[PDB]
């Protein structure tokens, strides 16, 4: 990898629940990827062009606890398992890849950067197959090109007997397509 990553837990369980109910998060926000949670489950969200994008199957309809109360979904594209909120101030946004590379890097929930070989528009095979548990909880995590630019957000995996052989992701082009629907 030419890219590295590290994680920082900013909230605990009790404070999490609380903030979920009020919808008011005054904690300072940093970084390009946020670790995100509802009461039941947890997953990632990625920032691209000022919008925080995550998966619909983790956050469905829900708002995002923000510094001035809850934030409504700007974008909701059930068809592509994609939702988006306006990035809380402080969230450093990634920008889309323009180079067309096939040498991708998926950044996971535990801050692993793992090589992915670009296969289609929304598809890429893992160079070293991992266990599924190694990947679970990373939906809404970013796929990056070698220069650290965004090509897509992690949606799903293809696997057999608990070992992940390939990854599906929403292409960054579909995010701008969703943003092209006023």
């Amino acid at each position: 990898a030419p890219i590295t990553a590290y994680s920082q837990q900013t909230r605990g369980l009790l404070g999490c629940i609380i903030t979920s109910l009020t919808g008011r998060d005054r904690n300072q926000v940093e970084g390009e990827v946020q670790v995100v949670s509802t009461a039941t489950q947890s997953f990632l969200a990625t920032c691209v062009n000022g919008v925080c994008w995550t998966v619909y199957h983790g956050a469905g309809s829900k708002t995002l606890a923000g510094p001035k109360g809850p934030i409504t979904q700007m974008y909701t594209n059930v068809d592509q398992d994609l939702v988006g909120w306006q990035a809380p101030p402080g969230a450093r946004s990634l920008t889309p890849c323009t180079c067309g590379s096939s040498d991708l890097y998926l950044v996971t929930r535990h801050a692993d950067v793992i090589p992915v070989r670009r296969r289609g528009d929304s598809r890429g095979s893992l160079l070293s197959p991992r266990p599924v548990s190694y990947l679970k909880g990373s939906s809404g995590g970013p796929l990056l090109c070698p220069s650290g630019h965004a090509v897509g957000i992690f949606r799903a995996a293809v696997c057999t007997r608990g070992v992940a052989k390939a990854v599906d992701f929403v292409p960054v082009e579909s995010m701008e397509t969703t943003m092209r629907a006023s």
Binding site: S7, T19, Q34, S37, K62, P70
Partner: peptide, 13 residues
């Protein structure tokens, strides 16, 4: 009902 909450972050470089 409830909101999604930011319980952490991943920094890149």
């Amino acid at each position: 009902k409830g909101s999604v909450v930011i319980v952490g972050r991943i920094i890149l470089s």
